[PDB]
Design a binder for this molecule. Sequence first.
Ligand SMILES: Nc1ncnc2c1ncn2[C@@H]1O[C@H](COP(=O)(O)OP(=O)(O)O)[C@@H](O)[C@H]1O
Ligand SMILES: Nc1ncnc2c1ncn2[C@@H]1O[C@H](COP(=O)(O)OP(=O)(O)O)[C@@H](O)[C@H]1O
Ligand SMILES: Nc1ncnc2c1ncn2[C@@H]1O[C@H](COP(=O)(O)OP(=O)(O)O)[C@@H](O)[C@H]1O
Ligand SMILES: [Zn+2]
Lengths: 433, 125, 315, 589, 55
Amino acid sequence: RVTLQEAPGTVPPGRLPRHREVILLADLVDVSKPGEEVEVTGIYKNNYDGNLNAKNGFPVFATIIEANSIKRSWTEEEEREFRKISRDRGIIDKIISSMAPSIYGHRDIKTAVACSLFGGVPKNVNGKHSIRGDINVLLLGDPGTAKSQILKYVEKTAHRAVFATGQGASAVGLTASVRKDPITKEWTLEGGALVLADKGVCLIDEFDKMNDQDRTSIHEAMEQQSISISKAGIVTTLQARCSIIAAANPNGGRYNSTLPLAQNVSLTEPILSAFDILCVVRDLVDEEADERLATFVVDSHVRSHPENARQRRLQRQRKKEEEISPIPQELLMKYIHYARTKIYPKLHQMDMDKVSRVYADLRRESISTGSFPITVRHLESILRIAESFAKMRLSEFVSSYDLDRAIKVVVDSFVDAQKVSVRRQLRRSFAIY
Amino acid sequence: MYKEKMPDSQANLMDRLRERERRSAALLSQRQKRYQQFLAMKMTQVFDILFSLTRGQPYTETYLSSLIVDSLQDSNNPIGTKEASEILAGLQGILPMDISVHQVDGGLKVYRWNSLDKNRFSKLL
Amino acid sequence: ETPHSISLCVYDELVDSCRAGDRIEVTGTFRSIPYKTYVDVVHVKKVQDLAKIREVAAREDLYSLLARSIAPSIYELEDVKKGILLQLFGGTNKTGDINILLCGDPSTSKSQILQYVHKITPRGVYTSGKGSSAVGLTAYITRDVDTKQLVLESGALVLSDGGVCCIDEFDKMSDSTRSVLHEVMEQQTISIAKAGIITTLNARSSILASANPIGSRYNPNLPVTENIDLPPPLLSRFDLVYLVLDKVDEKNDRELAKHLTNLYLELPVEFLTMYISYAKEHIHPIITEAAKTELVRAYVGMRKMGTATTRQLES
Amino acid sequence: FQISFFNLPTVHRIRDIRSEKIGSLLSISGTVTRTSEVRPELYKASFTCDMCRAIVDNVEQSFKYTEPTFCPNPSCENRAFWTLNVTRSRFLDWQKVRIQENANEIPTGSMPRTLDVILRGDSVERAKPGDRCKFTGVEIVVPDVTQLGLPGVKPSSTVRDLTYKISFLACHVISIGDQEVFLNSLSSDEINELKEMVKDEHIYDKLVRSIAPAVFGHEAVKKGILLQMLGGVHKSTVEGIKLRGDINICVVGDPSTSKSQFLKYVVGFAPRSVYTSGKASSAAGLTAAVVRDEEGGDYTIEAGALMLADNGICCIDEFDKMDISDQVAIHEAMEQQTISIAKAGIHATLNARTSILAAANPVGGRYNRKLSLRGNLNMTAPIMSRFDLFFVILDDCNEKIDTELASHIVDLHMKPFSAEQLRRYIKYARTFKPILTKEARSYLVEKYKELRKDDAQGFSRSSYRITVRQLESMIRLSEAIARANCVDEITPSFIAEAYDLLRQSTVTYDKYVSMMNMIVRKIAEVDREGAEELTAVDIVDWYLLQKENDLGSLAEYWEERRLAFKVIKRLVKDRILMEIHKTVYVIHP
Amino acid sequence: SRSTGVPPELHVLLPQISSMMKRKIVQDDILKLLTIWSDAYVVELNSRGELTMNL
Ligand SMILES: Nc1ncnc2c1ncn2[C@@H]1O[C@H](COP(=O)(O)OP(=O)(O)O)[C@@H](O)[C@H]1O
Ligand SMILES: Nc1ncnc2c1ncn2[C@@H]1O[C@H](COP(=O)(O)OP(=O)(O)O)[C@@H](O)[C@H]1O
Ligand SMILES: Nc1ncnc2c1ncn2[C@@H]1O[C@H](COP(=O)(O)OP(=O)(O)O)[C@@H](O)[C@H]1O
Ligand SMILES: [Zn+2]
């Protein structure tokens, strides 16, 4: 017996996710596991007659689906469009400039959002451990700067997005819960938010405000990509392969520019290491940036102001999408999905020198200046984002151009998180990168 | 956004304020006249409140007034408690045949409306 | 009735007459069915010595006699007598409560007066600092497990609605317990917002409080506000704060000694309560035009010496 | 096949649910507190005989599990034995809703009642927790066993017990909270009352004074409250981004400056408002509660303070007393207007379109004027930025102020628009959605630069009070200010008004300065344009011309004319306008 | 599955057809079938602005 729940990204506001009970018969058992997205064909009927009738006045029943067959998709006419754009000039710049069209600047975040949407390539060596392909982003900044609005844009554009908040969530509400079942009389387990976002993205707004017990579960979720629980006599493990985008605030509500990131937030260092991209946004006043930002915002509000007719409205909306973004949004949604599903770009050993030499050069400067030691996980992060950049072009092999941009993003984040005295020294040492 | 530099009427502006003074009371009177008509016409949609689901004479004016304000509270044009009193009392004046008012403890009681041809009386004003 | 309580049955047009927290006078029939004693309520109420009063009304030593009569076991303290008497008279609620704090060295008549007040006022409550909690003065509102209605299990500030609540060790009140006084003292309401419950109560009452000085004894070297452990927002609400100081002058010590020593060898309270109960029932004074100006000038002069918040003007 | 009535002229409160009305049609109003998941309910069943193969159809149940009493065929003698059919029978949707009495229904300080409503058919899922729904239907009695054990003689039938409790069966569900739609629902006379309240020159000034008319002074807050209750325009971005349109306000001041009076005014005036205070509030009670639901083995969301305050104003007193652990829960509703819940399997997002009006006191209980605005307050940047208006008010020993203050506070003990007239205005004004004019964008970026300049710290570039949220606030406040009048085009003037209110954080002072800004710009205009020179008398005559309509009578003319020269002399007294020798006035350096 | 003879709109039919064809079918494809046999289907337009076809 299995329950089917609405699609995470399609629930209308103000309603809990509708769900139904489904009846599975022999030879159709173990077809799916919790967190899977499946399509099932069956018969829709009422079957709770009997003991419920005399149990109470005005008795009620429930609707179930008798699973006859369950299943877990593109056309060439659509690929005629995807292949064309894939080889266009500046494909990576069109993608990044189309992330959050009505948000000014913050291009180091927009490139981080873009890479997290496409993701990398997971690997599982037999008889050894696996490697995750999901890209982890941490957004730390002063009040303002639209860190939360970014997570609201990721929610709508991504395929399967699960949104959470640090204080509004609980340890049970993330990992798993327990339900009774009279049919078999053993305890049954129902998954939380992390289980839903399997092969998807998990958004944790205000990541700092949750307690360490709630935060400990998130850490082991990104590391193991699975949920381990021993409650009510149930010991089992579920798949939790999800990408995380987190927004937070510094201590005191303002970022201390003269102290490292590891001393601006209560988030402990082992949890910080689980992120691939660490964006540190400052809000420092300057008439150069303020006139540009304000004139963008004052146009954003005058744009989004409310006020074959359907086709006319879609055409007008398309016109406004073009006016602020290079790529229409619904096409990009399809474009990202095809890249995620079809493209699995592979490495060339010709680029081994380009990767290893930069790493050794970056390691040499770590002991030279700065307190943050460069770790192998940084190199693991470089390959992942390198694969994601290749996945943007729909090319099956990693090119040298993708690696250069992949090196730029990781090095820039590592440099920008250092204190001011160390920050200026490292910017000159990595002017080439 | 500005106004006239030097109007030709310079000393006559004293007559201008005198003319405003001459009809200051008339404007306030029309404010009074209009506001009662706001209650004088609203009572048409009020005798349907009592006629529909009210069933005895022991209903007092305090209980009725709280009912009237709650029925029109959700509408686009809500009405206050003290306004409902002039509404409920307005009904008896135009309907002296089916509702009578008598006092106990200083409060008012409403006699059982025998609602009949309710709509015809409002047109005689 | 008392903290006991018994169940009542109500029928017909007597519904919509009682809500939780109300005070009722009941005339009904006592029943018993198997043991279950209850009242078939038959009615519900929710709301010669006149010349003798006049003979005292027009006398000349009226104020001194009333002030002296309240505490025959306590010497002098004329100003303390008047204000606490004025606490029992109260203001005049209109379409009123007066609160007093006693600050003084821990040997001067503080406890005895408060004991008298709650034993001379109807349904007064005696409270202390550590003897109460945040839900001690505040009624514990909860929701019924079978009828799902909102019910209240009474409280110190709810029991004494319209009466006087005596609080000893008012300084040693916990900060959480002290915090909820602000709404009670100024708005006479207790709003509670918890899981599933959102409602506000009424706790209209008068507060009589006694506070020991900071440390051991009053120190004139520190300012007055540093000898009181109350923040200004709370300290502004009290209508009267009495600084009771213990001197060493025999010209008043010996007279006090005689008053104490004359009491352990071998108007009355009935007149006093009859007097008080009459005044609260029939007397509704109205401030005159001439008396208006005095209130204005007194506050302006008091403000001009610059803690003269407007809470003292209504006092 | 179902029938649904609606549009009953009278709405009966929860306290009007009495047994004398069982079986009649009535309409009630009550805030929804819980909702249960829908289930199919047996409407018309069918059975097949056991002794023989006869079949019985059209077996109406009527609120109880009714089996057929006889086999219709005389060839069979079966009785009280039947087999329930699951195919020829018909089922219908059914849902239970727990509703609660509104705040405005019951007297202040009294407890609100509760009642359970039943929904069938298409009416299901139309009730959302926190909605101020209105139901239409009939009153029924259902079997009940909780009445046992109560005192009093219990009726019996013969033996069987027949206790009952009252429930409401609703056949229709509506949720109640654009100018042409709104205008079509009102008669001519409602228009005329509403039209005349708009078509007046000083309408903005009058509505500021009408807020809490018994409270003296604080014109800064009386402007703030009016704007918060009007609210702004909610916008959604094409890329899928939602723009908040509600205004948040905070007030801090002396323990004797009336601020709890304002909160008591709003909760007694706002159509949907909730009062709470400091330590008495909790995280679960404010936003929403996760609680075991009836009729099943699952959970449900029970509406918190904010959810009841949707499309309204939530008032909090003693905000600085609120614990940090529960101040956090307000954050998401203040900016995103949404509540995120992930606990016990209730993963959902709820509308939280609420405007917060908080009140608090300085850290030491008194404004220590020796320190700056930073030392006086314990609030931090994350929460301070979210308030479009942030007032700190002071009281000091001014002699004339106290005489006026004492005069008013005593008249209360001795004894321009009525409160009803405001609710007939705000409902109409809230339908307007202003649009920024092109030059207003140019002027807005000018002022945002100016505010960002002032808020800039002396050494570090980081600001503390003015952020990007405040730039939206300027539009959001300007929307509400324009929304108070009959224009959908934001003028530069309304940007200045929001600029003043956000930056602020004998002759009357206001009249003096108002005269100054009028005359000073007049001289600078003619000087920069090189017009002919004018004398002091001509300046006085010019100013009186500008305020022709504010003069109630020609008697007031002489007083204002006499008042004007005092303003001029004050400017010359401190050399604000230099005399050149009849004299000509030129701006001083 | 419809209690009435009103045909469903094309914007529902085409997605259902496209999955069966293992290939996306668009509006212009229907006009090809109509050209070959005029009386193949009824082509009355719905008042909602959506094309319909029926037996
Ligand atoms: N860099 C930016 N560019 C344009 N608008 C911004 C920017 N930062 C913030 N905003 C405005 O501020 C709002 C976002 O505020 P918020 O989500 O509360 O930020 P955070 O949650 O990171 O403090 C949006 O409505 C947006 O219009
Ligand atoms: N002015 C006074 N009149 C009468 N008795 C007094 C006076 N001052 C002190 N006393 C006596 O001193 C004792 C002090 O006790 P009490 O006032 O009850 O508590 P505390 O010792 O805390 O002040 C009392 O028993 C009282 O008899
Ligand atoms: N401008 C005013 N007009 C009238 N009354 C005032 C004014 N300012 C203060 N008051 C009086 O002072 C009291 C202020 O109490 P308040 O400051 O609300 O206490 P808290 O600081 O605990 O909320 C009110 O009861 C009010 O009657
Ligand atoms: Zn038979």
